[PDB]
Structure 1
């Protein structure tokens, strides 16, 4: 109820400087890479083997996993500077723009810009520019630069809209059998983006392009966290009507996707993280 997580657009210049700076410190120490690795790792962890589900995606644990991810990340930032929290990127209002790429989130003082065509869409503005920020590939090897290409795909030329959000927010069930990319009338599946894909979360990933467009590489872009903070906030909002909806499945689901199963690669359960307040942070507006 203490750490206040803010809209990237309500941050002061000081808050921006200090968040970027903390992020770079984590990078330099070597801790930022644990997160790329963790996310890649859970990606190839099938629940169960022979299945389309993995620990972080395409199943119920998708949300509590990323919540857990983000908590650990914020707490690492904290160890550096106890003032800094995680901002969220409200992409749905950026959807209202003529050119969403002109959002202040992509200023050189913050995330930096879209990839440069002349340079194969490598990001060359901001602090996370090539030369300033090392990327890691799927094998855990240096890849040579952050890439971005806003709206380059045919499936994801635009961002989710406010109306897409209100629409997921109407779903009353958290998730439904079989607990996968096929689940219908599922808030989890709808938020994730598979119902008439790609929507919301998935659409945003696809819209950014670069590493962000590929599962094993997405957390090479620090805006991965900004995006997953908006996702986590929307889940918070859904849970603002009461309560956690027994987070299906409670039981009898695949191991690692039940209320009290450990979420690889950690020992943390979904229940462990169902209430964000208990975790120690709150969203602005709350």
Structure 2
């Protein structure tokens, strides 16, 4: 039993020095430590709120919902910086936990930093972060049933940044450090890679819906693939949402003219944009949706090493509270939820990529070497293709409902002072001139990483059960994998590639 355990963050904290590629010229401070007020850390107790806080889509809020949120942020902004509830203090929380503020001294490892990103800590940490943030906002405006908006980018009209965030500084929800090309009611790109795609809005919307389906169904096949990999004291694959739509939105909003793409483009500065929290409000919602799908494998983590991991936050009373992963899995107990559509289906539920026609494919993926014929590690300074032996062919619906076939891209090594991304295509073999889109069945997804240099070693998982059917290759002994670099890959290597059956 070695769960990650935040220390007394008011006693053990150091300036952020990780994940910031240009510190000598950074727009926000790296002094992200919380105010030390001599408080004793209290244990969490479940809230006694009379009713459930209902978070609302940011593009369809009532007059009261918008006005309160706006009034709450104005109040938080007006607080002294040193106040732990202040706008600046709340932003620094993200910086402290994401950019090397804390050590694992409480677990007996004072020389190792805690990183809550790129692991199974990703979802529960942000859930707790928002929990206290929301309760703090409500107390500032004397609204005990106050609820955050959420950026519903899984809904077409929810996809552009909501106009409540736009205008100028006289709007509390406004932030000057945003990509000026992306704040004019333009549609978010949930698989953004730094380059604006010149495609019709209709197509971008369709692909955004496919991205949600991908993150929650095609690649989010089990707790490891969805939440992220196991992370314990003394020491991690990234999850489908985290390296997918979540990372895209950060890079899409951040200002590319700033040294570290501040604010949303980097973890240390993200919290200075009010939309950061509202984006994460929807990421929090994805966890709930993922469970509501009631598909095999869509279950919560039961590992004691996860359940007993804990963080510390200031609450609405400036008290320090220790919270555990085990206590945030049930929203009803945290006295909040999300206003849903009350319809038969999610708009993205059937956004599985269309089936590929055999008449659109040639016979083979071409002349390409197998893994065993290849010498690893392989440099990704150019497109890379290899055939990977599958554990079996022509599995029945029974076997597919018992085990996912999973593509593992292991030992991804690269300089993580810059945003990195490459894309993964499997069994791409179209006839010349065949019509293509950014969300074709061949596309397995991507590996994207916001800067987190402690140089760094990652792992990515892609589900193939649907894909092999969608591309008519469930009977081929090998899967041809194509890795395609988009940015920050000029020095990236890939140590191992393989496909495994992973029981549900």
- TM-score where L is the length of structure 1: 0.71
Contact 1:175 1:248 in 2 (8 A): no
Of 211, 215, 218, the residue aligned with 1:168 is: 215
Look up the match of 1:127.
171
How far off its partner does 1:155 sit? 3.2
- Structure 1, unaligned runs of 5 or more: 114-123, 134-144, 194-198, 252-257
- State the alpha-carbon separation in 2 of the partners of residues 233 and 8 from structure 1: 13
Does 1:219 pair with 2:271?
yes
- State the alpha-carbon separation in 1 of the partners of residues 221 and 208 from structure 2: 20
> What do the CA deviations read for 1:212-238 (whole angstroms, capped 9, x no partner)?
101101000000111001100111111
- State the alpha-carbon separation in 2 of the partners of residues 175 and 250 from structure 1: 15
Cα distance, 1:83–1:261 mapped onto 2, change above 3 Å: closer
| Aligned pairs for 1:115-154 within 5 A | 124=168, 127-128=171-172, 146-149=176-179, 154=193
Look up the match of 1:260.
308
- State the alpha-carbon separation in 2 of the partners of residues 150 and 16 from structure 1: 23
Cα distance, 1:50–1:58 mapped onto 2, change above 3 Å: farther
Of 60, 74, 79, the residue aligned with 2:134 is: 74
Secondary structure class of the residue paired with 2:251: helix
Cα distance, 1:128–1:46 mapped onto 2, change above 3 Å: same
Of 296, 299, 316, the residue aligned with 1:245 is: 299
Does 1:275 pair with 2:330?
yes
Look up the match of 1:203.
248
Contact 1:67 1:232 in 2 (8 A): yes
Contact 1:88 1:230 in 2 (8 A): yes
Does 1:179 pair with 2:230?
yes
Secondary structure class of the residue paired with 1:212: coil
Backbone CA RMSD of aligned residues: 3.2
- State the alpha-carbon separation in 2 of the partners of residues 76 and 69 from structure 1: 11
Secondary structure class of the residue paired with 1:163: helix
- State the alpha-carbon separation in 1 of the partners of residues 210 and 224 from structure 2: 21
Contact 2:94 2:271 in 1 (8 A): yes
Look up the match of 1:255.
none
Contact 1:128 1:146 in 2 (8 A): no
Does 1:284 pair with 2:335?
no
| Aligned pairs for 1:98-109 within 5 A | 100=160, 105=162, 107=163
Look up the match of 2:115.
55
Look up the match of 1:155.
194
Cα distance, 1:91–1:150 mapped onto 2, change above 3 Å: farther
Deviates more, 1:153-162 or 1:56-65: 153-162
- TM-score where L is the length of structure 2: 0.42
How far off its partner does 1:205 sit? 0.3
If each structure's helix is expressed as a fraction of its own residues, which one has the higher value?
A: 1
How far off its partner does 1:179 sit? 3.3
Secondary structure class of the residue paired with 1:71: helix
Of 79, 87, 90, the residue aligned with 1:35 is: 90
Does 1:112 pair with 2:161?
no
- State the alpha-carbon separation in 2 of the partners of residues 278 and 244 from structure 1: 20
Deviates more, 1:147-156 or 1:7-16: 147-156
How far off its partner does 1:68 sit? 0.2
- State the alpha-carbon separation in 1 of the partners of residues 328 and 195 from structure 2: 31
- State the alpha-carbon separation in 2 of the partners of residues 126 and 165 from structure 1: 34
Contact 1:86 1:229 in 2 (8 A): yes
Contact 2:120 2:229 in 1 (8 A): no
If each structure's strand is expressed as a fraction of its own residues, which one has the higher value?
A: 2
Does 1:26 pair with 2:76?
yes
Cα distance, 1:14–1:264 mapped onto 2, change above 3 Å: closer
Deviates more, 1:60-69 or 1:75-84: 75-84
> What do the CA deviations read for 1:107-156 (whole angstroms, capped 9, x no partner)?
2xx2115xxxxxxxxxx466148xxx8xxxxxxxxxxx730006688536
How far off its partner does 1:61 sit? 0.6
Secondary structure class of the residue paired with 2:54: strand
- Structure 2, unaligned runs of 5 or more: 1-50, 183-191, 198-203, 255-261, 314-320, 343-504
How far off its partner does 1:14 sit? 2.9
> What do the CA deviations read for 1:77-111 (whole angstroms, capped 9, x no partner)?
221322431110012335897xx4xx5x1x2xx21
